[PDB]
RNA sequence: GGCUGGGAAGGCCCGGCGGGGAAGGUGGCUCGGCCGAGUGUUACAGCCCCCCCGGCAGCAGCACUCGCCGAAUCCCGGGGC
RNA sequence: CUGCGGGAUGAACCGAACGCCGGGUUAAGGCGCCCGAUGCCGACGCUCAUCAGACCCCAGAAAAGGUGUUGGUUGAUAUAGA
RNA sequence: GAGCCUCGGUUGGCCUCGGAUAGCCGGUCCCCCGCGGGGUCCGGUGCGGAGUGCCCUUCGUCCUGGGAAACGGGGCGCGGCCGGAGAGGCGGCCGCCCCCUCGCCCGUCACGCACGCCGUUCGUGGGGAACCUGGCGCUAAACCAUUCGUAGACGACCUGCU
């Protein structure tokens, strides 16, 4: 009935000053701002949800216009609660500074 | 995860519901029961990776779970091949899944023992009837369950 | 879902960096009372720096030259734009998300505003050092509407004082009611304080 | 030479025996260095500077860390320094207040770097001596010699500024 | 206007560090920003500690500035610092914060229900008080 | 496992020895209610600190985490990609 | 005849040399924003500049001075009263 | 009621001024000033529990059958009295009709129990464009053409014409 996922901001790709690697995204999870509270989110599934013009299939329901890109959180990123994520398809860079859902059911609790 | 503990189911249609863990089947799936009167979750199978184990346990040692129900009992059998397969026929119809009254009697037998124990603890029935969700200012890494 | 910040008491660059970083991440930020922002260093030094900025102008056609905005809100907007990549679409979107106001308008005068301790003068600056008010700098560099903003802010302060008096009276009434009614809610405050509340 | 949390090392060494000199004398030094390798290197440097002895022509009989005898006691350490500035070298005498000799030496190194921009390779330490309440010439360490010490913490500048960054309440600096 | 002074024998609460959340008595002042401190009754060893990590409370037990780890303990036991600290409102709200941190899901649900009922009752009483005050003013 | 066969510390202390900060003392003065607080002068120890004689399990790099080198003087379990 | 990471920019500088990729770790360099990372409850001190300062090559300053301030060396006199 | 495109999202906080070698809250026996404000005194906290380390609302439904609490809410409920001008755009205070017994604890069952599998859950009756129901109101102005010179390279500009 409510939200069963955490909010994350797509900060950007894994990049240096003049080179970027689009296969590894950076996720800023709300509520964690240190590399001690990020142990819970390691290995968690993540989804980028976006709606498009043409209708697509939808499990357990009628076809909808919404689509998602799935991914997995690999490890934390530099003492500030940032985490690294790897998606099956690289993020389109349109989602820079946009919301993604960190699911809670690779549970290890 | 211990028998008699309370779990939160996160992936199924019973999203965020709270259930009672009874036993682990041969296949490794957890047998889950959220009282039909309270949680509307019958004898079902869940997965450990898709379950949150809360820190709430009831004394479940004094119950007799039926032996016959098992992983083979919790299985699907429909969608047979040899029929016509051409047109607007061949298993797109029948629109339903039967309730299998043996399932009803098993649920009654399990609930007759589950309900008195969970009603001994105050507010436990209400807690089970409530569902889990995330609100503003609450973080899973912060709060402990 | 939108940050509201009080510019009073905050350092210019210290607050601008945080605001720019937040607005890069899709967060909508509104800053009010930009005249209350204070910059480190003496006022004469800051005024000379801004006069040099004014002297920076296009020789052949100043109309195309740098746009030296005098209002404190626009000064803060420009200093955030200097930290944002305004040449790109993401930077332009961040600038559009950011909003700056002189004083505090009625759309935000009745909203609680956050304070950033990482950019406060008392936190980041030694008490023996000098600082210059952005309102004073703007007024002495070309701003026109300092007195009007001051009068409107005083009227808003009076109205907010009345509102705070009403809210404090309400809180006192709530305390009296709780004291009078605790006998029939003893079993609720007890379970509240067993878990770490009201203590 | 770099520096960290320095430790004191007693190093005894002697030149290798020769047919003319069967029993050479042994020399002992106190070297403050981060580890035993740099301690032995500094010992060889000082021995080469002082006597006619080289690392290839000698051997370190024993290098061992020296522990503070009274770690829990507060002491005044006077250190004699001979450093190299941009101009010619100078001699200095400094006083510090600390619990350990190694800590006092580290504090002296940090103070020298902060005040004179003197590097550890240019700094040479001659002697560190523990002294009583008297025989102290520096007012900075003399002011703490008071039985009824009493002073508050006036301007308590708060930390955890990046703990939740946006808050309604402004911080407090009086406690 | 200062009420707390760094005096020999004053108790202080360790805000952060290895011995975080413990009481410890200042024995001697080492430097401008370092003090010798001892925690015999609070499982803290005699050691140097900066003033930043320690927040001084309003308890001052008297013992010599260089006590040998025993007279400070005797003074602590005689003054019974632990009981007075537990009675102070500071430790009470510290314990309340710890309990809220340790709150579980079932406890959270019970707290939510209790808060709902208590807030409804308090709001009804406040509304009745407001209408009574308005009638009195009229 | 090694060390200065680790340094100090924790507890019971016992029979002595000298020195120092300057204290339930004395004392010029100051401030409040014989008492409490702040300053100074000789200065024993009934506040203590340090050294020399001599001994008890309470240790152990100690979860009173005060400051090392480590591994046939070393093994187990778990999580993430 | 030479790409690559850093020096904002770049022949010769630092690191390091090249088949197409996935994971991990570094060097030289950095961690307020642009821009990946100190969003450490970092440690010790110095510094007020109405021309402050901010990192090899490198893109800028000298002699002489200042009770501005922070340390060091030496020399006298002061209860027989400076 | 379908009907194309565009998307962000996944409860809200409706608010004092302010200082940092200081502040927050009451009563104010007392005094001054226009229920309110200021001053003295007194009493409670101040690593802030009148804490954004926070508060507010619960996020299953329906049947009856008890207790504690209890006259609250709704029908984009219908009509009056106001606050609000900074870039007001929202809220408050009173009358009349009908309906409901909702919060907190316990029994009492029933809700496709869709047999483990993902974009669930909402701010949304979202914003823009084209079409089907009614009631109350509307009636054009601009440009070209002509003319004029206070204007003019051409445009443009100042003017006249039931």
From Swiss-Prot, chain A:
GO terms for cellular component: cytosolic large ribosomal subunit; synapse. One of its GO terms (biological process) is translation. It is found in: Cytoplasm. Keywords: Acetylation, Cytoplasm, Ribonucleoprotein, Ribosomal protein, RNA-binding, tRNA-binding. The modification N6-acetyllysine is found at residues 7, 62. The modification N6-succinyllysine is found at residue 62. Disulfide bonds: none annotated. It comes from the Eukaryota. InterPro entries: Ribosomal_eL33, Ribosomal_eL33_CS, Ribosomal_eL33_sf, Transl_B-barrel_sf. GO terms for molecular function: structural constituent of ribosome; tRNA binding. It holds the Pfam family Ribosomal_L35Ae. Component of the large ribosomal subunit. The ribosome is a large ribonucleoprotein complex responsible for the synthesis of proteins in the cell. Required for the proliferation and viability of hematopoietic cells. Belongs to the eukaryotic ribosomal protein eL33 family. PANTHER family: 60S RIBOSOMAL PROTEIN L35A (PTHR10902). Component of the large ribosomal subunit. This is Large ribosomal subunit protein eL33. It comes from Oryctolagus cuniculus (Rabbit). The gene is RPL35A.
UniProtKB/Swiss-Prot annotation, chain B:
GO terms for biological process: cytoplasmic translation; ribosomal large subunit assembly. Transmembrane segments: none annotated. Component of the large ribosomal subunit. The ribosome is a large ribonucleoprotein complex responsible for the synthesis of proteins in the cell. The gene is RPL6. This is Large ribosomal subunit protein eL6. GO terms for cellular component: cytosolic large ribosomal subunit; rough endoplasmic reticulum. Keywords: Acetylation, Cytoplasm, Endoplasmic reticulum, Isopeptide bond, Phosphoprotein, Ribonucleoprotein, Ribosomal protein, Ubl conjugation. GO terms for molecular function: RNA binding; structural constituent of ribosome. The modification N6-succinyllysine is found at residue 64. Component of the large ribosomal subunit. May bind IPO9 with low affinity. The modification N6-acetyllysine is found at residue 96. It comes from Oryctolagus cuniculus. It is found in: Cytoplasm, Cytosol; Cytoplasm; Rough endoplasmic reticulum. Belongs to the eukaryotic ribosomal protein eL6 family.
Swiss-Prot record, chain E:
The keyword Ubl conjugation applies. The modification Phosphoserine is found at residue 138. The modification N6-acetyllysine is found at residues 78, 84. The modification N6-succinyllysine is found at residue 84. Keywords: Acetylation, Cytoplasm, Isopeptide bond, Phosphoprotein, Repeat, Ribonucleoprotein, Ribosomal protein, Ubl conjugation. The keyword Ribosomal protein applies. Coiled coil: none annotated. It comes from the Eukaryota. One of its GO terms (molecular function) is RNA binding. GO terms for biological process: ribosomal large subunit biogenesis; translation. It is found in: Cytoplasm. GO terms for cellular component: cytosolic large ribosomal subunit. There is a cross-link at residue 123 (Glycyl lysine isopeptide (Lys-Gly) (interchain with G-Cter in SUMO2)). Component of the large ribosomal subunit. The ribosome is a large ribonucleoprotein complex responsible for the synthesis of proteins in the cell. Component of the large ribosomal subunit. Belongs to the eukaryotic ribosomal protein eL14 family. This is Large ribosomal subunit protein eL14. It comes from Oryctolagus cuniculus (Rabbit). The gene is RPL14.
